[PDB]
């Protein structure tokens, strides 16, 4: 009843203190997002505009954005109307509202994935676990219809069916699109979209280290010498006759 | 009047009897850092807390994207938040050590330093719960919901008073935005106590590590503890900054970068670490007001301290009974902050049990007892 | 809530009045079936699942 | 037999004030009692508890304590003060119970 | 906040001290330094670690128990059918 | 005699010191962020968008 | 009297270039302190970064 | 830079609210130094002349 | 109170409409600055006119 499984921990490439995000694998992973994941799935804080200088160009980014429909408005007549995307725009709702998302989802809410791997212990290693561990109860147990066996998600039954499966969608970068690798690049580019810093604050980190151990050292130095007038100080007794 | 500005200057004046000619004894460890540290963590919360509270908006519908919109389009706005949200902890961190130096040393004979340091714990503790509500994710809401629903143990007004503080029926927007206002507050009142504090422990100056007088043995604060001091602060700024930019969210829960949702309750309501051992006591005693008075007195005891003390030694350096008893009450203070972390079940619930009562017991009984025990094995 | 058969009979057939706040299971209802409540645990305000 | 004898120079060097070259007494707390016990001493037993404490504040900064031959000896250990200090508290008490009509 | 000067009534004691810049800032490390860091952490050890030790246990023990409730106990389906 | 010129040039006057302390920092911060921003890069060849870029900067159509 | 009074021997924590008595400590002085201000200039350098 | 943006907006409403909230604590901090230099000397009284004799 | 170009005016609005005597408060608020500066003219004024600035 309390029983659950923990995913191991996966050695990604951005695991390590002073490890940025594989840019390549964080590209893929966006094209995952857009022709897989958000049909269902919302990510309301990041915009086309963040792509930039980051996974795409300026030009395919703009691209990117004018594939989509937005509603503006309202015009001369208080009319609400559709307009090309901009890349100041963020990526778009697959739904309205979560009653229509439930409704279009046997009553299940897909959560928006902006900071999924933030919201979830085990981040990445959990959403990876879960993207790949579908499988078949074991005997004594049985999903109510509607539902799918995960081991991984807690509870066991989730309201999402395997979203990924080979050849799903074809990496225009070549890359062999295999269950596995497309969960992999999809899960680094959910670490990027929950923090986009990201790199940069590892950078910072770096310096911060370095500056600190030497900064750290020249004071105690200083303080040792200034000490050094009571550390060796002697005394004595020398009462009267 | 004075040959020197440094001594004349009504300004300065104040500056160099605080700072620069004060008297220290010459013997105090490095215990005795965690007061300007402390000082440190509240300019800085300050400074940080206004560089955010720039760009945050107190409504229940824009309080977790504004955070949001901070740390992902302002300048450095993310560097703020986890420097901000971490030195919460340095701060904690900072005060629990303060505390157990007093404690230890009998800091606590200096009555009324003391008295307004337990004070300051309190505000603290106040400002750090307004104020990790703002983020207004599920943790922030339902921690919130917990905490202001202990009050309602309070016979008679209580329900009154909660309905009040909340300014509805329950945790909502006119709670966040008052609650806005008091964590804007609040740090001023620990900044204003804090002179309070320094002010009556200087009319008796620093305790030191040997409890026997130093007015033999005095040295300016300049240079000796300014530089000290500084070390003390590069110290322990690397671990600061080694968690905060290398483990942001090390000591975070999840939880909180979901929404709140008044309709889902998360399965595990913890608190954030250093509230972890008081929330361990509140739930040791299964009556509702019976664990809000225990968590009161959890705290409350420390008034008392100052009445409990038997040693004819002022601190227990020389007494190697009391030095047992205390690191039993520190690791007793592990095994609550572990207990309070985990659900209500066996064998946590018994060991939380016990770990209270003993919390209580080593407090209250064994150290004044072994206090009078440690007397007359010295023949006094 | 709407409460079936076990959740009706199972519950008048439980001591009358033994419990925190002794009620009759029909105490607080218009219609056996019917079971309108506040969701609020009325310790510190959480929700029941 | 010596069991309470035996205990209390266990504590003596459990408590390890000794190391520092201090006697028992120049370890008590400050208090109003002893205050006034300390005003009554003799100008050299009083200039020589100084210089004791003068010197573990001294070690006490260096992190040091003195060889283990300078440690004080349970048995030579000099209650200086405590004769003092007993006629101070006995004077205290006896104004006090003499206010208490 | 005026203090040097008025606190305390010494006689008979001379002190030696050398500039900074007359000595060393950390000397004898091996000689004094560790020995004593040696001499500290020894007398200390059984006076701290102890209860330390003792929370850790409680630790372990209640952690592993916790998890061995969770376990299934084979002797409740030995006769299910 | 570094240490001793590097004294009666730089460090003996305050005011000297402080023009020391200033171009001191001046240089460190040019040859500190160079350096660190390399050490950092190195440890990621072919991870940053640095290393990617040339790839779609302008390549296709 | 104070003419049996003598300074103790600080040898075990002179520094290097001053251990010898028969040797003018002016000759050092420069560099004695050209270090020490060295480290005390460079933790400014790096503070001021 | 004061604006936080091209002109008075929203950046400029939340941080004039934050300045709003903390100048009059500054002010009663100030208040403090006012006062305190002035009791080096006493105030002053509407003839001018030392009042020394008339306190 | 809300800091927020969309929300300013009317948490106002709101809190003159619907806070108990937040009408008041905000009255007293509005008006105290006025009094603040009537008091601040005046004793910059005895300042000057009785040489206070020295
Ligand atoms: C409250 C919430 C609790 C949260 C968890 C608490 C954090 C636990 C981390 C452990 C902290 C590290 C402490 C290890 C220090 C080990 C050490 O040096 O101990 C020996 C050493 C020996 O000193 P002397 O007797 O003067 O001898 C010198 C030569 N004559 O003792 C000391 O350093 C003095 C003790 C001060 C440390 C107190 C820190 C404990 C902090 C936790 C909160 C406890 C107090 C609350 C009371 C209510
Ligand atoms: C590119 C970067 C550009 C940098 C611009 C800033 C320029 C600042 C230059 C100011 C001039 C500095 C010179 C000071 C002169 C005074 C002096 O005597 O030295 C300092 C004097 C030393 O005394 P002596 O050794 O006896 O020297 C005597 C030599 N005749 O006092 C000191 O030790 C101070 C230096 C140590 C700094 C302590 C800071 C450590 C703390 C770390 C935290 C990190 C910083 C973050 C800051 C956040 C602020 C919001
Ligand atoms: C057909 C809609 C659909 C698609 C396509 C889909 N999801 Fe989901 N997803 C859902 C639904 C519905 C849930 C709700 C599951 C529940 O709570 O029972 C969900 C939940 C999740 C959760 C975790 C929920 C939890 O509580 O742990 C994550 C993570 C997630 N999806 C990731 C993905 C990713 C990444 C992809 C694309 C590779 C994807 N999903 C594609 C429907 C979908
Ligand atoms: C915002 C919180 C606090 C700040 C900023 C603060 C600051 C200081 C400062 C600057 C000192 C002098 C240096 C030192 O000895 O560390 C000091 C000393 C002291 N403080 Fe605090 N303090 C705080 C909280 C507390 C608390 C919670 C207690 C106790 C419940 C406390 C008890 C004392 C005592 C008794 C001393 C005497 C130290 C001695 O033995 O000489 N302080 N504090
Ligand atoms: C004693 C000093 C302070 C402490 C202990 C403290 C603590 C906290 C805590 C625990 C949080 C939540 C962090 C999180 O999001 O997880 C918080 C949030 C916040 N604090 Fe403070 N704070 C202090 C002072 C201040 C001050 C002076 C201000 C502003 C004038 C301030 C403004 C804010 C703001 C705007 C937030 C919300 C944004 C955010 O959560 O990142 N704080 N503070
Ligand atoms: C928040 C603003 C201020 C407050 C709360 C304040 C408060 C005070 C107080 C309490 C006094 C003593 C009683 C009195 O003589 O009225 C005083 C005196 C004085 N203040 Fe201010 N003051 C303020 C602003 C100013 C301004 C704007 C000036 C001048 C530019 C000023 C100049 C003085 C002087 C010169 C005195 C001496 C009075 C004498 O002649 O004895 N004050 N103020
Ligand atoms: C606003 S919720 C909250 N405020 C904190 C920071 C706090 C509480 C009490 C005293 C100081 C600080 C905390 O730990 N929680 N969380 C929480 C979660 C579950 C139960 C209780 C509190
Ligand atoms: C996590 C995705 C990072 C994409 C950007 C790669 C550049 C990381 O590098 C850093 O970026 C910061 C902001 O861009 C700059 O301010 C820093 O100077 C730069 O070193
Ligand atoms: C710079 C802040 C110094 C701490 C304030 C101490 C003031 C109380 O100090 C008293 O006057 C003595």
């Given at each position: 009843g309390?029983?659950?499984?923990?995913?191991?921990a996966?050695p990604?490439?951005?695991?390590?203190?002073?490890?940025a995000?594989?840019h390549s694998?964080?590209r893929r992973?966006?094209?995952?997002?857009?022709?897989?994941?958000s049909?269902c799935?919302?990510?309301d804080?990041?915009?086309?505009?963040?792509l930039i200088?980051?996974?795409h160009?300026?030009?395919?980014a703009?691209?990117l954005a004018?594939?989509?429909?937005?509603?503006?408005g309202?015009?001369?007549?208080?009319?609400?109307?559709?307009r090309?995307?901009?890349?100041?725009?963020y990526?778009?709702?697959?739904?309205?509202?979560?009653?229509?998302?439930?409704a279009?989802?046997?009553?299940?809410?897909?959560?928006?994935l902006?900071?999924i791997?933030?919201?979830?212990?085990?981040?990445?290693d959990?959403?990876?676990?879960?993207l790949?561990?579908?499988?078949?109860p074991?005997?004594?147990?049985?999903?109510?219809?509607?539902?799918?066996?995960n081991?991984?998600?807690?509870?066991?039954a989730?309201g999402?069916?395997?979203?990924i499966?080979n050849?799903?969608?074809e990496y225009?970068?070549?890359?062999?699109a295999?269950?596995?690798?497309?969960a992999?690049?999809?899960?680094?580019?959910?670490?990027?979209?929950?923090?986009?810093?990201?790199?940069?604050?590892?950078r910072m980190?770096?310096?911060?280290?370095?500056?600190?151990?030497?900064?750290?050292?020249?004071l105690?130095?200083?303080?040792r010498?200034k000490?050094?007038?009571?550390?060796?100080?002697?005394?004595?007794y020398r009462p009267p006759? | 009047?004075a040959?020197?500005?440094?001594?004349?200057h009504?300004?300065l004046?104040?500056?160099?009897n605080?700072?620069?000619?004060?008297?220290?004894?010459?013997?105090?460890?490095?215990?005795?850092?965690?007061?300007?540290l402390?000082?440190?963590c509240?300019?800085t919360?300050?400074?940080?807390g206004?560089?955010?509270?720039?760009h945050y908006?107190?409504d229940?519908?824009?309080?977790?994207?504004s955070?949001?919109?901070?740390?992902?389009?302002?300048?450095?706005?993310?560097?703020?938040r986890?420097?901000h949200?971490?030195?919460?902890?340095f701060f904690?961190?900072?005060?629990?050590?303060?505390?157990?130096?007093?404690?230890?040393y009998?800091?606590?004979?200096?009555?009324?330093?003391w008295?307004t340091?337990?004070?300051?714990?309190?505000?603290?503790?106040?400002?750090?719960?307004?104020?990790?509500?703002?983020?207004?994710?599920?943790?922030?809401f339902?921690?919130?919901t917990v905490?202001?629903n202990?009050?309602?143990?309070?016979?008679?007004?209580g329900?009154?008073?909660?309905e009040?503080?909340?300014?509805?029926?329950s945790v909502?927007?006119?709670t966040?935005?008052?609650?806005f206002?008091?964590?804007?507050?609040?740090?001023?009142?620990?900044a204003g106590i804090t002179?309070i504090?320094?002010?009556?422990?200087?009319?008796?100056?620093?305790?030191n590590?040997?409890?026997?007088?130093?007015?033999?043995?005095?040295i300016?604060?300049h240079?000796?503890?300014?530089?000290?001091?500084?070390?003390?602060?590069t110290?322990?700024?690397?671990?600061?900054?080694?968690?905060?930019?290398?483990?942001?969210?090390?000591l975070?829960?999840?939880?909180?970068?979901?929404?709140?949702?008044?309709?889902?309750?998360?399965?595990?309501?913890?608190?954030?670490?250093?509230?972890?051992?008081?929330?361990?006591?509140?739930?040791?005693?299964?009556?509702?007001?019976?664990?809000?008075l225990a968590?009161?007195?959890?705290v409350?005891?420390?008034?008392?301290?100052p009445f409990?003390?038997?040693s004819?030694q002022?601190?227990m350096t020389?007494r190697?009974l009391?030095?047992?008893?205390?690191?039993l009450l520190?690791a007793?203070?592990?095994?609550?902050?572990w207990?309070?972390?985990?659900?209500?079940?066996?064998?946590?619930?018994?060991?939380?049990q016990?770990?209270?009562?003993?919390?209580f017991?080593?407090?209250?009984?064994l150290?004044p007892?072994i206090?009078?025990?440690?007397?007359?094995?010295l023949?006094? | 809530?709407?409460?079936?058969?076990?959740?009706?009979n199972?519950e008048?057939?439980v001591?009358?009045?033994?419990?925190?706040d002794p009620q009759?299971?029909?105490?607080?209802?218009?219609?056996?079936?019917?079971?309108?409540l506040?969701?609020?645990c009325?310790?510190?305000?959480?929700?029941?699942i | 037999?010596?069991?309470?004898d035996?205990?209390?120079?266990?504590?003596?060097?459990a408590?390890?004030?000794?190391?520092?070259?201090?006697?028992?007494?120049?370890?008590?707390?400050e208090d109003?009692?002893?205050?006034e016990?300390?005003?009554?001493?003799?100008?050299?037993?009083y200039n020589?508890?100084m210089?004791?404490?003068?010197?573990?504040?001294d070690?006490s900064?260096?992190?040091?304590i003195l060889?283990?031959?300078?440690?004080?000896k349970?048995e030579?250990?000099?209650?200086?003060?405590?004769?003092?200090?007993?006629?101070?508290?006995?004077?205290?008490?006896?104004?006090?119970?003499?206010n208490?009509? | 906040?005026?203090?040097?000067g008025?606190?305390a009534?010494?006689?008979?004691?001379?002190?030696?001290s050398?500039?900074?810049?007359?000595?060393?800032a950390?000397?004898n490390?091996?000689?004094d330094?560790?020995?004593?860091?040696?001499?500290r952490?020894?007398?200390?050890?059984?006076?701290?670690?102890?209860?330390?030790?003792?929370?850790?246990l409680?630790?372990?023990?209640?952690?592993?128990?916790f998890?061995?409730?969770?376990?299934?106990?084979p002797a409740?389906?030995?006769?299910?059918? | 005699?570094?240490?001793?010129?590097a004294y009666?040039?730089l460090?003996?006057?305050?005011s000297?010191?402080?023009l020391?302390?200033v171009?001191?920092?001046?240089?460190?911060?040019?040859?500190?962020?160079?350096?660190a921003?390399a050490?950092?890069?190195?440890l990621?060849?072919?991870?940053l968008?640095?290393?990617?870029?040339?790839?779609?900067?302008?390549?296709?159509? | 009297?104070?003419?049996?009074?003598?300074?103790?021997?600080?040898?075990?924590?002179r520094?290097e270039?001053?251990?010898?008595?028969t040797?003018?400590?002016?000759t050092?002085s420069?560099?004695?302190?050209?270090?020490?201000?060295?480290?005390?200039?460079?933790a400014?350098?790096a503070?001021?970064?």
């Open positions: 309390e029983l659950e499984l923990h995913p191991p996966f990604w490439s951005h695991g390590g203190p002073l490890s995000l594989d694998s964080v992973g966006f094209q995952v997002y857009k022709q897989v994941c049909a799935h919302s990510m804080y990041v915009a086309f505009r963040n200088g980051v996974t160009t300026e030009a395919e703009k691209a004018e594939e989509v429909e937005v509603q503006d309202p015009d001369e007549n208080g009319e609400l109307f559709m090309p995307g901009k890349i100041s725009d990526f778009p709702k697959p739904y309205p509202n979560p009653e229509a998302a439930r279009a989802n046997n009553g299940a809410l897909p959560p928006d902006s900071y791997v933030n919201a979830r212990h085990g981040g990445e959990y959403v990876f676990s879960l790949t561990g579908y499988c078949d074991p005997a004594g147990v049985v999903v109510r219809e509607g539902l799918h066996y081991p991984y998600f807690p509870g066991q989730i999402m069916a395997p979203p499966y050849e799903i969608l225009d970068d070549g890359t062999p295999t269950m596995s690798q497309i992999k690049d999809v899960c680094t580019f959910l670490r990027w979209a929950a923090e986009p810093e990201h790199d940069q604050r590892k980190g770096l310096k911060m280290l370095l500056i600190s151990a030497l900064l750290t050292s020249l105690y130095y200083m303080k010498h000490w050094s007038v009571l550390k060796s100080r002697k005394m004595a006759k | 009047m040959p020197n500005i440094r001594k004349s009504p300004l004046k104040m500056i160099n605080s700072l620069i000619d004060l008297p220290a004894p010459s013997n105090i460890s490095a215990w005795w850092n965690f007061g300007s402390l000082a440190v509240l300019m919360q300050i400074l940080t206004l560089l955010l509270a720039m908006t107190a229940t519908s824009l309080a977790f994207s955070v949001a919109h901070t740390c992902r389009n302002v300048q450095y706005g993310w560097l703020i986890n420097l949200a971490n030195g919460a902890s904690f961190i900072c005060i629990f050590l303060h505390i157990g130096r007093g404690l230890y009998g800091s606590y004979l200096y009555k009324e330093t008295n340091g337990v004070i300051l714990l309190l505000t603290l503790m106040a400002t750090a719960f307004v104020g990790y509500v703002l983020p207004w994710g599920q943790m922030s339902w921690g919130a905490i202001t202990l009050f309602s143990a309070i016979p008679y007004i329900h009154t008073l909660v009040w503080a909340w300014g509805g029926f909502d927007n006119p966040l935005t008052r609650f206002a008091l964590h804007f507050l609040l740090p001023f009142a620990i002179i504090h320094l002010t009556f422990l200087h009319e008796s100056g620093s305790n590590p040997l409890g026997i007088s130093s007015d033999s043995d005095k300016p604060f240079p000796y503890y300014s530089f000290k001091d500084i070390l003390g602060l110290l322990m700024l690397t671990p600061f900054l080694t968690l905060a930019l290398f483990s942001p969210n090390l975070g829960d999840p939880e909180n970068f979901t929404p709140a949702n008044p309709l889902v309750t998360p399965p595990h309501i913890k608190p954030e670490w250093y509230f972890l051992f008081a929330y361990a006591i509140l739930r040791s005693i299964p009556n509702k007001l019976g664990g809000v968590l009161a007195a959890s409350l005891i420390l008034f008392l301290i409990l003390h038997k004819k002022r601190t020389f190697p009391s030095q047992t008893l205390f690191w520190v007793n203070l592990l095994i609550l902050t207990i309070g972390s985990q659900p209500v079940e066996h064998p946590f619930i018994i060991i939380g016990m770990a209270s009562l003993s919390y017991t080593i407090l209250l009984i150290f007892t206090g009078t025990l440690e007397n007359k094995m023949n006094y | 809530r709407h409460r079936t058969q076990a959740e009706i199972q008048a057939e001591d009358v009045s033994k419990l925190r009759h299971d029909l105490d607080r209802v218009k219609k056996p079936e019917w079971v309108i506040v969701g609020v009325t310790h510190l305000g959480c929700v029941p | 037999g010596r069991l309470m035996r205990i209390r120079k266990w504590y003596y060097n408590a390890g004030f000794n190391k520092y070259g201090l006697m028992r007494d120049d370890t008590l707390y109003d009692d002893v205050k016990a300390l005003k009554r001493l003799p100008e050299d037993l020589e508890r210089f004791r404490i003068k010197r573990a504040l070690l900064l260096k992190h040091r060889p283990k031959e300078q440690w004080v349970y030579e250990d000099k209650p200086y003060l405590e004769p003092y200090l007993k006629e101070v508290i006995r004077e205290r008490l006896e104004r006090e119970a003499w208490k009509k | 906040g005026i203090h040097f008025n606190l009534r010494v006689r008979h004691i001379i002190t030696y050398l500039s900074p810049f007359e000595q060393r950390i000397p490390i091996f000689s330094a560790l020995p004593n860091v040696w001499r952490f020894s007398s200390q050890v059984f006076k701290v670690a102890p209860p330390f030790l003792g929370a850790y409680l630790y372990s023990w209640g952690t592993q128990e998890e061995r409730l969770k376990r299934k106990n409740d389906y030995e006769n299910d059918q | 005699a570094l240490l001793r010129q009666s040039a460090f003996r006057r305050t000297t010191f402080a020391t302390v171009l001191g920092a001046v240089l460190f911060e040019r040859a500190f962020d160079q350096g921003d050490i950092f890069e190195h990621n060849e072919g991870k968008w640095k290393h990617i870029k040339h790839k779609y900067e302008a390549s296709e159509e | 009297v104070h003419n049996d009074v003598t300074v103790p021997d600080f040898s075990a924590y520094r270039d001053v251990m010898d008595a040797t003018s400590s002016q050092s420069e560099d004695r302190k050209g270090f020490s201000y060295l480290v005390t200039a460079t400014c350098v503070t001021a970064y």
